[PDB]
């Protein structure tokens, strides 16, 4: 699985959650509707199939 | 509702219809009944009502 790092930028999580292209969008430790109001020290996007 | 939004109709659930259309309380007493109706709610050419 390939790990892309995200740091030092402004993240818009509303575009991804509001997009209907995703079969499931389920979140642990956070509620996605509030993701736009949080500040994260680092984010790791690990992608695979 | 649409088919696999059926589990958005539940207490403490998030999604499109669980927050914008029909929100149940956390302390919801009662219960949910769902049955497929592809017969009188579906028509060729699309039902847009």
Swiss-Prot record, chain B:
Q: What is the effect of changing residue 43 to T?
A: In strain: Omicron/BQ.1.1
Query: Integrin-binding motif: where is this region?
Result: 2-4
Q: Which domain of life is it from?
A: Viruses
Mutagenesis or variant effect for residue 16 to T? In strain: Gamma/P.1
Q: What does this protein do?
A: Attaches the virion to the cell membrane by interacting with host receptor, initiating the infection. The major receptor is host ACE2. When S2/S2' has been cleaved, binding to the receptor triggers direct fusion at the cell membrane. When S2/S2' has not been cleaved, binding to the receptor results in internalization of the virus by endocytosis using host TFRC and GRM2 and leading to fusion of the virion membrane with the host endosomal membrane. Alternatively, may use NRP1/NRP2 and integrin as entry receptors.
Subunit record text: Binds to host ACE2. RBD also interacts with the N-linked glycan on 'Asn-90' of ACE2. Cleavage of S generates a polybasic C-terminal sequence on S1 that binds to host Neuropilin-1 (NRP1) and Neuropilin-2 (NRP2) receptors. Interacts with host integrin alpha-5/beta-1 (ITGA5:ITGB1) and with ACE2 in complex with integrin alpha-5/beta-1 (ITGA5:ITGB1). May interact via cytoplasmic c-terminus with M protein. May interact (via N-terminus) with host bilirubin and biliverdin, thereby preventing antibody binding to the SARS-CoV-2 spike NTD via an allosteric mechanism.
Name of this chain's protein:
Spike protein S1
Species of provenance: Severe acute respiratory syndrome coronavirus 2 (2019-nCoV)
- Report which part of the complete sequence is shown: 402 to 450 of 1273
């Amino acid at each position: 699985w390939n790990r892309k790092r995200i740091s030092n930028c402004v993240a818009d999580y509303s575009v991804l959650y509001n997009s209907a292209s995703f079969s499931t969008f389920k979140c642990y430790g956070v509620s996605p509707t509030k993701l736009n109001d949080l500040c994260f020290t680092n984010v790791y996007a690990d992608s695979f199939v | 509702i649409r088919g696999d939004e059926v589990r958005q109709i539940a207490p403490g659930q998030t999604g499109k219809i669980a927050d914008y259309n029909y929100k149940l309380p956390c302390d919801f007493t009662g219960c949910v009944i769902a049955w497929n109706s592809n017969n009188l709610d579906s028509k060729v050419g699309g039902n847009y009502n």
